[PDB]
């Protein structure tokens, strides 16, 4: 077992790739785009490109954080949910997923149901909060 770099475990199966999640997660907002940048210097050809690059980096980070909040997974690397798996998105067994597939192949297999699954996860978290307000 050796530590990997950014996306170094893209070609390994899930069972081995999921042990390097913090490598990809640690590089989502922080980069050299936020440097001091060494005729308005902020209006030059490459002063504008740096600016919109800074805004691009933020939106990409907030696009994922928006869902984590809705699903109740804020502050978690691996977050367990209360949504049962539906054997229409995929019916592969444990060994056919975590020992035979890469994260790229899998996310392509269920690509048709990611939008449907996202809506269910939000609805599930909403029910937990409803069931908690009228239980305490």
């Amino acid at each position, epitope marked *: 077992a050796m530590i990997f770099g950014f996306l170094g475990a893209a070609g390994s*199966t899930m*069972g*081995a790739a999921s042990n390097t999640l913090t490598v990809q997660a640690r590089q989502l907002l922080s980069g050299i785009v936020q440097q001091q940048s060494n005729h308005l210097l902020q209006l030059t050809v490459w002063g504008i490109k740096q600016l919109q690059a800074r805004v691009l980096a933020v939106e990409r980070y907030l696009e994922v954080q928006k869902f984590l909040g809705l699903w109740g997974c804020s502050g978690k690397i691996i977050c367990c949910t209360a949504v049962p798996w539906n054997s229409t998105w995929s019916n592969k067994s444990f*060994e*056919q997923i975590w*020992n*035979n597939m890469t994260w790229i192949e899998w996310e392509r297999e269920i690509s048709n149901y990611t939008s449907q699954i996202y809506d269910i996860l939000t609805e599930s978290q909403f029910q937990q909060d409803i069931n908690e307000v009228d239980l305490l």
Partner: nanobody, 119 residues
Framework: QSYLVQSGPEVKKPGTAVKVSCQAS????????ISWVRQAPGKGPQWMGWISPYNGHAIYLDELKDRLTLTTDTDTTTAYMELRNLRSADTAVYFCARDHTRQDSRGYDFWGQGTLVTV
């Protein structure tokens, strides 16, 4: 996809050395491990060894530990098995078997047609 083909039969005098090659094609060779088993006539298969075509790591059987060595070739995607000091009881059909999955296979997906060697 994927298919393993072995060589033709051989008739080798006892005491000689025999090498049998299993050729893999139509699939990613390095992803799945390769196993060798021998099935004597009127008997059941016997497990011999398991070779990983990715990093070359090999696993052998004690009785065959000092007699059998497995090597793998990547550029032409061929698996080789050589056996030396051929006892008279080594006559059996030899198979090359592909692993079920890329990790912790617990099963063999595809086999070869077999190579009967007489000693």
């Amino acid at each position: 996809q994927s298919y393993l083909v072995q060589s033709g039969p051989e008739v080798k005098k006892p005491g000689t050395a025999v090498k049998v090659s299993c050729q893999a094609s139509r699939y990613p060779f390095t992803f799945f491990g390769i196993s060798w088993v021998r099935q004597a006539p009127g008997k059941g298969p016997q497990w011999m060894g398991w070779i990983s075509p990715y990093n070359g790591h090999a696993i052998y059987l004690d009785e065959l530990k000092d007699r059998l060595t497995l090597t793998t070739d990547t550029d032409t995607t061929t698996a080789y098995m050589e056996l030396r000091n051929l006892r008279s009881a080594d006559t059996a059909v030899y198979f090359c078997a592909r692993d079920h999955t890329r990790q912790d296979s617990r099963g063999y997906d595809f086999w070869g047609q077999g190579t009967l060697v007489t000693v």
